[PDB]
Each structure stands twice: as structure tokens, then as C-alpha cells.
Design an enzyme around this catalytic site. Structure first.
Site, PDB file in Angstrom:
ATOM      1  N   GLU A  23     -33.779  -8.440 -51.682  1.00  0.00           N
ATOM      2  CA  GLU A  23     -34.434  -9.360 -51.702  1.00  0.00           C
ATOM      3  C   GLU A  23     -35.944  -8.673 -51.157  1.00  0.00           C
ATOM      4  O   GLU A  23     -36.979  -9.220 -51.411  1.00  0.00           O
ATOM      5  CB  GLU A  23     -34.168 -10.367 -50.590  1.00  0.00           C
ATOM      6  CG  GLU A  23     -32.660 -10.913 -50.899  1.00  0.00           C
ATOM      7  CD  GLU A  23     -32.446 -12.268 -50.166  1.00  0.00           C
ATOM      8  OE1 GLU A  23     -32.385 -12.335 -49.161  1.00  0.00           O
ATOM      9  OE2 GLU A  23     -32.649 -13.184 -50.777  1.00  0.00           O
ATOM     10  N   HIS A  51     -22.460 -19.197 -53.077  1.00  0.00           N
ATOM     11  CA  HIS A  51     -23.756 -18.342 -52.975  1.00  0.00           C
ATOM     12  C   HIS A  51     -23.797 -16.901 -52.640  1.00  0.00           C
ATOM     13  O   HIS A  51     -24.691 -16.152 -53.310  1.00  0.00           O
ATOM     14  CB  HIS A  51     -24.720 -18.960 -51.909  1.00  0.00           C
ATOM     15  CG  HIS A  51     -24.959 -20.494 -51.797  1.00  0.00           C
ATOM     16  ND1 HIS A  51     -24.220 -21.171 -50.848  1.00  0.00           N
ATOM     17  CD2 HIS A  51     -25.345 -21.381 -52.691  1.00  0.00           C
ATOM     18  CE1 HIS A  51     -24.462 -22.586 -51.064  1.00  0.00           C
ATOM     19  NE2 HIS A  51     -25.262 -22.700 -52.238  1.00  0.00           N
ATOM     20  N   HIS A  79     -26.816  -9.455 -51.399  1.00  0.00           N
ATOM     21  CA  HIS A  79     -27.477 -10.279 -52.332  1.00  0.00           C
ATOM     22  C   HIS A  79     -27.608  -9.235 -53.539  1.00  0.00           C
ATOM     23  O   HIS A  79     -27.753  -7.827 -53.160  1.00  0.00           O
ATOM     24  CB  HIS A  79     -28.957 -10.591 -51.919  1.00  0.00           C
ATOM     25  CG  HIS A  79     -29.103 -11.435 -50.810  1.00  0.00           C
ATOM     26  ND1 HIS A  79     -29.099 -12.840 -50.927  1.00  0.00           N
ATOM     27  CD2 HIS A  79     -28.851 -11.430 -49.458  1.00  0.00           C
ATOM     28  CE1 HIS A  79     -29.134 -13.335 -49.539  1.00  0.00           C
ATOM     29  NE2 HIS A  79     -29.024 -12.524 -48.983  1.00  0.00           N
ATOM     30  N   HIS A  95     -23.457 -10.244 -45.585  1.00  0.00           N
ATOM     31  CA  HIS A  95     -23.290 -10.891 -46.912  1.00  0.00           C
ATOM     32  C   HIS A  95     -24.305  -9.865 -47.536  1.00  0.00           C
ATOM     33  O   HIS A  95     -24.790  -9.064 -47.022  1.00  0.00           O
ATOM     34  CB  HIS A  95     -23.473 -12.082 -47.141  1.00  0.00           C
ATOM     35  CG  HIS A  95     -24.744 -12.422 -46.514  1.00  0.00           C
ATOM     36  ND1 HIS A  95     -25.255 -12.834 -45.161  1.00  0.00           N
ATOM     37  CD2 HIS A  95     -26.294 -12.294 -47.170  1.00  0.00           C
ATOM     38  CE1 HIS A  95     -26.427 -12.941 -45.148  1.00  0.00           C
ATOM     39  NE2 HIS A  95     -27.243 -12.959 -46.231  1.00  0.00           N
ATOM     40  N   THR A 128     -33.410 -16.412 -45.862  1.00  0.00           N
ATOM     41  CA  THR A 128     -33.869 -16.133 -47.229  1.00  0.00           C
ATOM     42  C   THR A 128     -33.056 -17.160 -48.084  1.00  0.00           C
ATOM     43  O   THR A 128     -33.329 -17.193 -49.502  1.00  0.00           O
ATOM     44  CB  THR A 128     -33.778 -14.920 -48.040  1.00  0.00           C
ATOM     45  OG1 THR A 128     -32.367 -14.520 -47.899  1.00  0.00           O
ATOM     46  CG2 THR A 128     -34.489 -13.743 -46.892  1.00  0.00           C
TER      47      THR A 128
HETATM   48  N1  LIG Z   1     -29.997 -14.372 -46.463  1.00  0.00           N
HETATM   49  S1  LIG Z   1     -30.258 -14.301 -44.670  1.00  0.00           S
HETATM   50  O1  LIG Z   1     -31.478 -14.536 -44.192  1.00  0.00           O
HETATM   51  O2  LIG Z   1     -29.770 -13.213 -43.918  1.00  0.00           O
HETATM   52  C1  LIG Z   1     -28.999 -15.774 -43.903  1.00  0.00           C
HETATM   53  C2  LIG Z   1     -28.269 -15.669 -43.053  1.00  0.00           C
HETATM   54  C3  LIG Z   1     -27.605 -16.716 -42.600  1.00  0.00           C
HETATM   55  C4  LIG Z   1     -27.601 -18.109 -43.214  1.00  0.00           C
HETATM   56  C5  LIG Z   1     -26.757 -19.152 -42.586  1.00  0.00           C
HETATM   57  O3  LIG Z   1     -26.017 -18.778 -41.816  1.00  0.00           O
HETATM   58  N2  LIG Z   1     -26.737 -20.607 -43.234  1.00  0.00           N
HETATM   59  C6  LIG Z   1     -25.749 -21.415 -42.325  1.00  0.00           C
HETATM   60  C7  LIG Z   1     -26.068 -22.352 -41.289  1.00  0.00           C
HETATM   61  C8  LIG Z   1     -27.370 -22.399 -40.867  1.00  0.00           C
HETATM   62  F1  LIG Z   1     -28.461 -21.719 -41.538  1.00  0.00           F
HETATM   63  C9  LIG Z   1     -27.926 -23.176 -39.689  1.00  0.00           C
HETATM   64  F2  LIG Z   1     -29.035 -23.304 -39.457  1.00  0.00           F
HETATM   65  C10 LIG Z   1     -26.737 -23.997 -39.111  1.00  0.00           C
HETATM   66  F3  LIG Z   1     -27.048 -24.773 -37.887  1.00  0.00           F
HETATM   67  C11 LIG Z   1     -25.408 -23.760 -39.505  1.00  0.00           C
HETATM   68  F4  LIG Z   1     -24.496 -24.376 -38.808  1.00  0.00           F
HETATM   69  C12 LIG Z   1     -24.834 -22.947 -40.552  1.00  0.00           C
HETATM   70  F5  LIG Z   1     -23.548 -22.762 -40.708  1.00  0.00           F
HETATM   71  C13 LIG Z   1     -28.656 -18.253 -44.231  1.00  0.00           C
HETATM   72  C14 LIG Z   1     -29.040 -16.994 -44.665  1.00  0.00           C
HETATM   73 ZN   LIG Z   2     -29.157 -12.587 -46.870  1.00  0.00          ZN
END
Ligand SMILES: NS(=O)(=O)c1ccc(C(=O)NCc2c(F)c(F)c(F)c(F)c2F)cc1
Ligand SMILES: [Zn+2]
Ligand SMILES: [Hg+2]
EC number: 4.2.1.1
Length: 258
Positions: A104, A62, A94, A92, A196
Site C-alpha cells: 500500500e 478482504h 495486502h 494481516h 487503509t
Molecule cells: N489496513 S490497516 O489500515 O492496517 C487496518 C487495520 C484495521 C482495520 C479494522 O480493524 N477494521 C475493523 C473495525 C474498525 F475499523 C472499527 F473502527 C471498529 F470500531 C470495529 F469494531 C472494527 F471491528 C482496518 C484497516
Molecule cells: Zn492493512
């Protein structure tokens, strides 16, 4: 199959598996600068990244994430609209297929070339997993990237991209100093929002910096050479991994400056 940014599994389809996509505090949003409320009670941001310990960089299909050791208060964010200490776990970006899109969040509908997200979780909750179950569990520091002069401190990230070209690949990435990615001013806008990307959890106090950092065309071009696909599968360039702006609904965006 699962989620992504293509025509058949992109943002417009997310609601089907993640109903929260149509929630009340979704991100990103458009920042209307004339409607943002100057809140003089907001404290200055306090970024303490001097003890930061980067560990790895990986392509997760992603985006690419640079992970940090968050077992101790090594790199933290506090102050601003935050109550408590938030620990940096990873960052990270985008970005878009062209220089005119990629961010975003937008400012008065203006889109930037990319957006850096420095993810932090509220330490009072113990671990990242628990923080994602709280309305104030995460704080993401967002920084806009515009195409202009090269950002020296971003080069180490750029050079290593060759080794993590496809989904699932990782590379040791130690001794990276995230302070090299911060703009000169720490002025910001803040609002309650969400992740997001799926699961789109509605935690997250967004802190979007007013001042963008500039990177060179060559630097952002290397981002666009990454792949969404895994090794041996048909090549799909990793570009346009951003979610369009969501309705602000019943929220107010506050600014730390006038
Ligand atoms: N673009 S952003 O808004 O900054 C954004 C930051 C982090 C994540 C993420 O860490 N996903 C992994 C993840 C989760 F989102 C969980 F809720 C969880 F429990 C996990 F174990 C995990 F690896 C997604 C979006
Ligand atoms: Zn992000
Ligand atoms: Hg939450």
C-alpha cells in the site's frame, strides 16, 4: 453490494459511502525519501512480543487476519514517535496479483510484493472501539515483503491458509510468534494517517520499517489462492487487496535515520 477491491466497488468508489476517503490524513502515501525529515528526537521503537498469544486466523473477505489476545499487555509496541503503550490486536497483509505490486505504501514510488500490517491500539483508551475515535488511537507497524528467499517464520501462516480459503472461515491458530516476521533493523518512517480500508478512520500513527523482509515466490503464491467470496459462491481470487497512494497534503514524514 458493499466495499471491496473490484472495478465496481473498489477504492475509487469508497468516498461515496465513506466521505472521509477524501480527508486530510488518508493512507497509504508515497514515501519520498529525499523529502522525509530526519528527526533526531524520535526514540527507538520498542517491540515487546515475547508474551504474545495468537488465537485465531480468519478470512474476512478482504484479507486474512491473525488475531491475538489483547485483554492484557501481552504483546505491545511503545517508543518511537508514540506516547503510551499500544497493544497488538491482530495482523494481516495486502498483496498483489503479481510480484511488482501489492504494497500500500510505496518508497519513492517503488511498490513491494506485499505489506504486513501489525495493528495496535492505544491502551489509554480502554478498547479497540474507543481507540478508533481518537487521533492517536492506533499505531500500525507496516513491513514490506519482497520476493526472494523464504521466510521460515511465515510458513505456519502459509500452511493453514488451505483451511480458511473462503470468506467467513476461521481456524484455531495458537502459539504463533510474530517476532518471526520482523526484519533485522527497526529503522522507520512515521507520519499521521488512517486505516487503509473503510471506515478509513483518521487515527493511526503509521510506523513503516525501512527494511523489507523477504518471502519466497511459493509463499506469496499461497496468499493468491485465497477467495474473496464465501463458500458456494462464484470464485474470485483474493489478490490486489491494496489501496493506491493518497495525497500527502499538509503532512510531514519523519525518519528515524539519516
Ligand atoms: N489496513 S490497516 O489500515 O492496517 C487496518 C487495520 C484495521 C482495520 C479494522 O480493524 N477494521 C475493523 C473495525 C474498525 F475499523 C472499527 F473502527 C471498529 F470500531 C470495529 F469494531 C472494527 F471491528 C482496518 C484497516
Ligand atoms: Zn492493512
Ligand atoms: Hg480517529
Amino acid at each position: 453490494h458493499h466495499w471491496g477491491y473490484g472495478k465496481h466497488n473498489g477504492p475509487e468508489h469508497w468516498h461515496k459511502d465513506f466521505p472521509i476517503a477524501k480527508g486530510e490524513r488518508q493512507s497509504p502515501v508515497d514515501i519520498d525519501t529525499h523529502t522525509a525529515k530526519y528527526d533526531p528526537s524520535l526514540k527507538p521503537l520498542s517491540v515487546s512480543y515475547d508474551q504474545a498469544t495468537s488465537l485465531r486466523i480468519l478470512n474476512n473477505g478482504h484479507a486474512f487476519n491473525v488475531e491475538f489476545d489483547d485483554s492484557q499487555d501481552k504483546a505491545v509496541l511503545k517508543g518511537g514517535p508514540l506516547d503510551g503503550t499500544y497493544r497488538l490486536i491482530q495482523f494481516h497483509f495486502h498483496w498483489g496479483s503479481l510480484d511488482g505490486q501489492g504494497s500500500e505504501h510505496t518508497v519513492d514510488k517503488k511498490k513491494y510484493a506485499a505489506e504486513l500490517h501489525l495493528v495496535h491500539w492505544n491502551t489509554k483508551y480502554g478498547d479497540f472501539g474507543k481507540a478508533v475515535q481518537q487521533p492517536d488511537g492506533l499505531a500500525v507497524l507496516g513491513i514490506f515483503l519482497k520476493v526472494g528467499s523464504a521466510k521460515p517464520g511465515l510458513q505456519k501462516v502459509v500452511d493453514v491458509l488451505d483451511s480458511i480459503k473462503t470468506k467467513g472461515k476461521s481456524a484455531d491458530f495458537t502459539n504463533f510468534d510474530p517476532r518471526g516476521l520482523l526484519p533485522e533493523s527497526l529503522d522507520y518512517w512515521t507520519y499521521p494517517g488512517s486505516l487503509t480500508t473503510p471506515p478509513l478512520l483518521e487515527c493511526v500513527t503509521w510506523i513503516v520499517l525501512k527494511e523489507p523482509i523477504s518471502v519466497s515466490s511459493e509463499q506469496v503464491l499461497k496468499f493468491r489462492k485465497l477467495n474473496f467470496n464465501g463458500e458456494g459462491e462464484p470464485e474470485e481470487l483474493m489478490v490486489d487487496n491494496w489501496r493506491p497512494a493518497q495525497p500527502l497534503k499538509n503532512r510531514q514524514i519523519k525518519a528515524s535515520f539519516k
